[PDB]
Write an enzyme that holds these catalytic residues in place. Structure first.
Site, PDB file in Angstrom:
ATOM      1  N   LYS A   1       0.861  -1.177   0.000  1.00 26.18           N
ATOM      2  CA  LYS A   1       0.000   0.000   0.000  1.00 26.18           C
ATOM      3  C   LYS A   1       0.890   1.217   0.000  1.00 26.18           C
ATOM      4  O   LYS A   1       1.836   1.265   0.816  1.00 26.18           O
ATOM      5  CB  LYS A   1      -0.825   0.076   1.276  1.00 26.18           C
ATOM      6  CG  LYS A   1      -1.839  -1.020   1.453  1.00 26.18           C
ATOM      7  CD  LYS A   1      -2.717  -0.666   2.674  1.00 26.18           C
ATOM      8  CE  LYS A   1      -4.142  -1.237   2.571  1.00 26.18           C
ATOM      9  NZ  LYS A   1      -5.025  -0.633   3.609  1.00 26.18           N
TER      10      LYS A   1
ATOM     11  N   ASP B   1      -0.752  -6.060  -6.692  1.00 29.76           N
ATOM     12  CA  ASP B   1      -2.129  -5.687  -6.840  1.00 29.76           C
ATOM     13  C   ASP B   1      -2.604  -6.132  -8.216  1.00 29.76           C
ATOM     14  O   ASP B   1      -1.822  -6.224  -9.175  1.00 29.76           O
ATOM     15  CB  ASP B   1      -2.306  -4.169  -6.714  1.00 29.76           C
ATOM     16  CG  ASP B   1      -3.783  -3.735  -6.865  1.00 29.76           C
ATOM     17  OD1 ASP B   1      -4.166  -3.083  -7.908  1.00 29.76           O
ATOM     18  OD2 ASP B   1      -4.619  -4.023  -5.983  1.00 29.76           O
ATOM     19  N   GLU B   2      -3.889  -6.375  -8.333  1.00 34.32           N
ATOM     20  CA  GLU B   2      -4.467  -6.780  -9.625  1.00 34.32           C
ATOM     21  C   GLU B   2      -4.240  -5.786 -10.812  1.00 34.32           C
ATOM     22  O   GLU B   2      -4.145  -6.191 -11.950  1.00 34.32           O
ATOM     23  CB  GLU B   2      -5.952  -7.126  -9.482  1.00 34.32           C
ATOM     24  CG  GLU B   2      -6.843  -5.965  -9.106  1.00 34.32           C
ATOM     25  CD  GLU B   2      -6.798  -5.662  -7.617  1.00 34.32           C
ATOM     26  OE1 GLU B   2      -7.300  -4.560  -7.212  1.00 34.32           O
ATOM     27  OE2 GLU B   2      -6.242  -6.505  -6.836  1.00 34.32           O
TER      28      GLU B   2
ATOM     29  N   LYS C   1     -14.543  -5.254   8.284  1.00 36.26           N
ATOM     30  CA  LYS C   1     -14.767  -4.666   6.945  1.00 36.26           C
ATOM     31  C   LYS C   1     -15.620  -5.546   6.008  1.00 36.26           C
ATOM     32  O   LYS C   1     -16.789  -5.223   5.746  1.00 36.26           O
ATOM     33  CB  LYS C   1     -13.419  -4.299   6.271  1.00 36.26           C
ATOM     34  CG  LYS C   1     -12.657  -3.121   6.950  1.00 36.26           C
ATOM     35  CD  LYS C   1     -12.192  -2.046   5.951  1.00 36.26           C
ATOM     36  CE  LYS C   1     -11.019  -2.523   5.078  1.00 36.26           C
ATOM     37  NZ  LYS C   1     -10.505  -1.463   4.133  1.00 36.26           N
TER      38      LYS C   1
ATOM     39  N   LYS D   1       2.581  -9.960  -2.853  1.00 36.33           N
ATOM     40  CA  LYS D   1       1.528 -10.010  -3.847  1.00 36.33           C
ATOM     41  C   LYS D   1       1.385  -8.692  -4.567  1.00 36.33           C
ATOM     42  O   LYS D   1       1.249  -7.671  -3.962  1.00 36.33           O
ATOM     43  CB  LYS D   1       0.188 -10.448  -3.231  1.00 36.33           C
ATOM     44  CG  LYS D   1      -0.969 -10.549  -4.261  1.00 36.33           C
ATOM     45  CD  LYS D   1      -2.235 -11.157  -3.636  1.00 36.33           C
ATOM     46  CE  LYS D   1      -3.448 -10.987  -4.584  1.00 36.33           C
ATOM     47  NZ  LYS D   1      -3.592  -9.496  -5.057  1.00 36.33           N
TER      48      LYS D   1
ATOM     49  N   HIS E   1      -6.458 -14.244  -9.085  1.00 38.01           N
ATOM     50  CA  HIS E   1      -7.186 -13.097  -8.594  1.00 38.01           C
ATOM     51  C   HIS E   1      -8.521 -13.035  -9.335  1.00 38.01           C
ATOM     52  O   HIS E   1      -8.592 -13.281 -10.534  1.00 38.01           O
ATOM     53  CB  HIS E   1      -6.440 -11.820  -8.923  1.00 38.01           C
ATOM     54  CG  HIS E   1      -6.793 -10.678  -8.028  1.00 38.01           C
ATOM     55  ND1 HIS E   1      -8.011 -10.039  -8.083  1.00 38.01           N
ATOM     56  CD2 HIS E   1      -6.061 -10.023  -7.084  1.00 38.01           C
ATOM     57  CE1 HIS E   1      -8.035  -9.066  -7.182  1.00 38.01           C
ATOM     58  NE2 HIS E   1      -6.861  -9.035  -6.564  1.00 38.01           N
TER      59      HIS E   1
END
Lengths: 408, 414, 408
Positions: free
Chosen positions: B150, B178-179, B308, B176, B268
């Site tokens: 992030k 991000d897509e 969440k 990982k 994903h």
């Protein structure tokens, strides 16, 4: 354990493969013998200890029919498809036609027939051309096709072969055919034969307006067979001949892919087959062989004839011919090739008994004609025309000098 | 019309060699039976000239039809003569194609499908599965951990290398992408592959623990293949593909590629919610996960039970149960849990969903007050605690990084 | 953080990509919901600690328009091109059409449209042929083209398919079309279909002097699709059909390069689209799908029609058709393909409403004609001729027995 494989009330699903065997037991009961065929052709033996494997139980073959038959027994055995590598006729034959022949608990064992279910059969293409595809590229809509093997069957130079070929094709033969043993020699190399014979082929086509072809023998170690097939396709040939029993199933399956890519039909010569199809008590039937060959996809295959000089028992040959020509899902029908001492005078009988969907191999009658091979070809074509048209041979002979001389 | 009713027979018993599809639907101006037959027809042979023998043989049959909530569920049997075996693309063209556009339905949802053995045997399933991955990762019992950096976009290769170093060094198993994070002028894939696996190898040498990288190879297929080749050449054992955006045709081919190269696939599921979310229309996540497992993804995102993501427990558990179930030769797939996960949630997560998970808790980790390395340690510590049955407050006494995460979370809520 | 992404006074540059969404918030304000779409489709969240990455700030998406719309809201969001891998429609859709659909802060989310700037769009070729290129190779200058899918849609042998094809093409159909699910089967393998159907195609061309083509379905795993496209090109085909939604965007982008090399036009079947285009509150519109497909470069794509048997609301279909045919920099226009219960009697209305630049797929009307498919094709071609010429169908019918019978 062998009795766990016998359930004479079992009703096989439509997704099981069925094999039919003839056997004679040797010191064991018919049921034990049958069970032994089933175990040996499936999972073998076990329920002792050290982990039964998870798919073994679901892969057991089952004898579901057992009846006395003459001096022995017929068994039918159902095989779940978990036993098989799909698309590999080789592996099928290792299971159902392998070690079972050597078992000491059987005096004799014959594989009579098999019946693949749709989910097995769908992974085979069958003939690329079949009867209808051949008839299309040969331009011969109704009558049987004709074929001739030169005599002697060996020893010609390329030039001498080309001259015989010119004469046969010109007189009316549709298919020149190499003998099973005639592959490539110092005095007649395959590459030089291919380059010459297709030039003569194209010349005869130009002069006669009839399509001519060449059942050219590509038989060899598989790499050599593949190179020979490429040569043939490159020269404009649409057929290759393979001695399928001598070459074997592994090479044939692969060549079927080669011929698919190259647009070639396959003529299957069945030399060596009698080594295991002839004995009525032991081996594999010609029927089962023909079935496997058709499934992979030979376009034409030798089955024999009904005369005296070929002899040939009528029921067996008819049965094979009927199978080859029958509807069988997506598998195209295959031309039976009749050979054995055939000659113009036998054509009406051959065609009455066996139909018009045949390749008639009549090398003896043609080559041995007193006016020469060209005349012999003409004579054969005329006997066939008369057979189809319902015309008596002696009537035809009054307008066909070549046929007249042959009937003497 | 009566033609569509020819596809309905509620006493038919399907053979074990027929494929079954289950649909929810709501009719629009026709009877329920006529809607169902329309579905069966449109997904089989459709509707003077000689009706071929194979067409008659290839007719689907509705053999079950009951009311369900505001609509109906049908089960339909499909002979394998309708299918090109080995082609999941073609199966979905038949049973999940024009059928959704039908005017005689208000809504249509593909709920599940059941391929027979003779269809299923032409798929390999995961190359690695749960057990293959646990073997190459050297992690026998606990869940694996993953983190997406992030923010999700904008890193140089050098900045990304530095975050990766910290995450892996702190204990994360899998970095990982991000897509959306593929290849950019400031972070080209070739450069990232040549740098990040050197960092990875460094961390393995320093910690004695295996580290991997769910690297995003998503693109036009020729590009994904080339990127998969680069990952294998650098020593990578995983590639990440956004399988919904990329699509089934590319995924079937890529499964052959990853077979050749010995690479596991992390799927994903971005864009899935465009058709999986509506409870009356689309394709369920279940059906999608089944197709992905047959082709053979090794891990796939399913969802979690969290603050969440208050995702439905029962649907998530159904999917995970399917993914981990015995299914002939098809290896089990790791569910990947994500969505607002932090250390304090590990005991509930593992209690509810078990130890065979990949836990993507990027937010908790990246947001730890002492930085990513400390977040990674805190996550690993909470997971060990859950597995050993130790209270998080107890574990926190020997783990300052967990202590601080638990405290700060408590200071962050009303 | 989600509010940092909302600036309702921002004026996007001509180099930003714009996406238009419909949504309904779930327990949050419209602005927060909008911000969430923008963050999730761009950089996500962060300003805490541990180094903000250098390009994050410049890659933030911005909501610059937000208005109430019925039961929800429309937002427009501007995306800097630093967010995107140029030339990868796949990566664009992962950003703007990915995780955003699953966000729990939205009850519903629909991607309505997008607007790529010149610097994004220049890395896409669009259709290789488009309307004008197809009209050129088909030799059809003004009228709409015709297409027919055989009924039933499955179960034919290659020979049976070839006979239907002969009849359709001969009667006047321009394009034979395989059904979306009709790929390759044991009873109709793609390779044998390709070898036969293009021979029949060339025969009909010789006999009629009209160009005929085949929207042959190459759909499969990408390697298989590529091999099938090579087969088609090798036989002289100029079209391939792909089920683009089922196959997916990664395969389509690659196939666009394959078809460029081979000189093939692409017909896009849109089967499965309704799974996410049908719901007015949630999914991706057909418009946005059509836009992406046109940018990559399908040459023709299904959009629907205006009748009762297809129903089809007029505004939505018209809007898509107008986009497909509009000038759009270097991207060639794409033929809309009208299908759904079409038949000769509807042709004047279809053409009044939707124009002459259409591929009209009218399989039902053609196959179901009381005199056969050949007559049905003729009838359709005659209804189209009359529509274009301003002639009443009943007037034409006096010189067209085939059309006369169809109108009954």
């Amino acid at each position: 354990w062998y009795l766990d494989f016998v359930d004479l009330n079992y009703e096989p699903g439509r997704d099981e493969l069925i094999v039919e065997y003839y056997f004679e037991p040797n010191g064991v009961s018919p049921e034990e013998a049958a069970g032994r065929i089933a175990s040996e052709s499936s999972i073998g033996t076990w329920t002792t200890l050290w982990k039964l494997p998870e798919m073994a139980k679901r892969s057991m073959a089952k004898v579901f029919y057992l009846e006395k038959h003459g001096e022995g027994y017929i068994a039918k055995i159902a095989y779940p498809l978990t036993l098989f590598e799909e698309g590999s006729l080789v592996q099928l034959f290792s299971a159902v036609a392998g070690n079972v022949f050597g078992m000491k608990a059987l005096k004799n064992l014959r594989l009579l027939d098999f019946h693949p279910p749709y989910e097995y059969l769908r992974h085979f293409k069958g003939p690329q051309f079949g009867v209808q595809g051949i008839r299309e590229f040969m331009g011969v809509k109704d009558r049987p096709l004709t074929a001739t093997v030169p005599k002697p069957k060996m020893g010609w130079s390329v030039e001498e072969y080309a001259e015989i070929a010119y004469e046969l094709w010109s007189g009316g033969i549709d298919l020149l055919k190499d003998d099973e043993n005639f592959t490539s020699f110092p005095f007649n190399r395959f590459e030089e034969r291919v380059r010459k014979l297709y030039r003569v082929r194209d010349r005869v086509e130009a002069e006669t307006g009839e399509t001519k072809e060449y059942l050219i023998n590509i038989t060899g170690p598989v790499n050599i067979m593949e190179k020979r097939a490429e040569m043939v396709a490159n020269e404009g040939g649409q057929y290759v001949m393979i001695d399928i029993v001598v070459a074997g199933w592994s090479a044939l399956q692969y060549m079927r892919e080669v011929t698919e890519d190259l647009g070639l039909a396959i003529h299957a010569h069945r030399a060596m087959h009698a080594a295991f199809t002839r004995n009525p008590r032991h081996g594999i039937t010609m029927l089962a062989l023909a079935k496997a060959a058709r499934m992979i996809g030979v376009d034409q295959i030798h089955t024999g004839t009904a005369v005296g000089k070929m002899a040939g028992n009528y029921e067996e040959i008819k049965r094979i011919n009927d199978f080859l020509l029958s509807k069988w899902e997506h598998i195209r029908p295959v031309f039976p090739v009749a050979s054995g001492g055939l000659h113009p005078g036998l054509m009406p009988e051959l065609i009455r008994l066996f139909g018009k969907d045949l390749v008639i191999q009549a090398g003896g009658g043609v080559m041995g004609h007193p006016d020469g091979p060209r005349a012999g070809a003409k004579a054969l074509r005329d006997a066939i025309d008369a057979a189809i048209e319902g015309v008596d041979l002696d009537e035809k002979a009054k307008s066909s000098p070549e046929l007249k001389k042959s009937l003497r």
